[PDB]
């Protein structure tokens, strides 16, 4: 994390720059796609382990980081057993499965909330 510390600033800058385009003018999303495509490529070559909370919004088909949150369809339904929150865009038509349930809040606090109590300085 000496030389790799510089690399963290170059990833969240292009992530935030795609939000500034869509905050001022929506329905023209070519800047939000390229800023996410450059963000994924730097993390692909310079290997970094990003959080699954942000990465589940990037919509790993090609690139859309903010587009399914305000334009596309994200709903709840029950396919076979437990209910699933299906995140599907309108460009590559790929889906991401995420189950929402009170029986597995202990496992729902396992990837994200366990690092909030164990990652010490």
């Amino acid at each position: 994390p000496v030389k790799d510390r510089e690399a963290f600033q170059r990833l969240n800058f292009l992530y935030q720059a795609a939000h500034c385009v869509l905050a001022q003018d929506p329905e023209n999303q070519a800047l939000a796609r390229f800023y996410c495509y450059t963000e994924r490529t730097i993390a692909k070559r310079l290997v970094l382990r990003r959080d699954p909370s942000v990465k589940r919004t990037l919509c790993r088909g090609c690139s859309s980081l903010l587009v399914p949150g305000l334009t596309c369809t994200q709903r709840q339904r029950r396919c076979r057993g437990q209910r699933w929150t299906v995140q599907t865009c309108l460009t590559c038509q790929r889906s991401q499965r995420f189950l929402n349930d009170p029986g597995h809040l202990l496992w729902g606090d396992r990837p994200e909330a366990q690092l909030g109590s164990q990652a010490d300085s």
């Binding site: 510089e6 690399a7 600033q9 170059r10 800058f13 292009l14 935030q16 720059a17 500034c20 385009v21 001022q24 003018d25 023209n28 070519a30 800047l31 796609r33 390229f34 800023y35 495509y37 450059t38 490529t41 730097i42 070559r45 310079l46 090609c62 590559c92």
Partner: protein, 145 residues
Amino acid sequence: LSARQRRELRLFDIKPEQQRYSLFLPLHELWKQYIRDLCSGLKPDTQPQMIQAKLLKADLHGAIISVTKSKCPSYVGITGILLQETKHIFKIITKEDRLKVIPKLNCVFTVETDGFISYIYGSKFQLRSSERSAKKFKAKGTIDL
């Protein structure tokens, strides 16, 4: 995965060309606070060799440029901030709405910081700028301009 990401293109359209270029200033304002958060020392005497070395791998998206030298006389003197950045071209948008494409073939760009001015010779800086931050910027040749 190759043609499926390239169905229409990731290219612009006709309607985002007229998005009132002064509204692209918070993209430049985001970049302006980004450089102050990168080195965090500017004023008294803080290593001008370090400033030109950290901008080698820095993502310069949304930065002001002005062509002071180019092999074409028509390319020299175009000001504006950039939006895309491809292999050996990068698309800029200028004053009152019109976009222009200037290639990175043999030219230099002038980037104005708060208290610094850095020239970027566009003949060595190419080859998919996401990979520019990764690796392989070595010492080769001169830039005869």
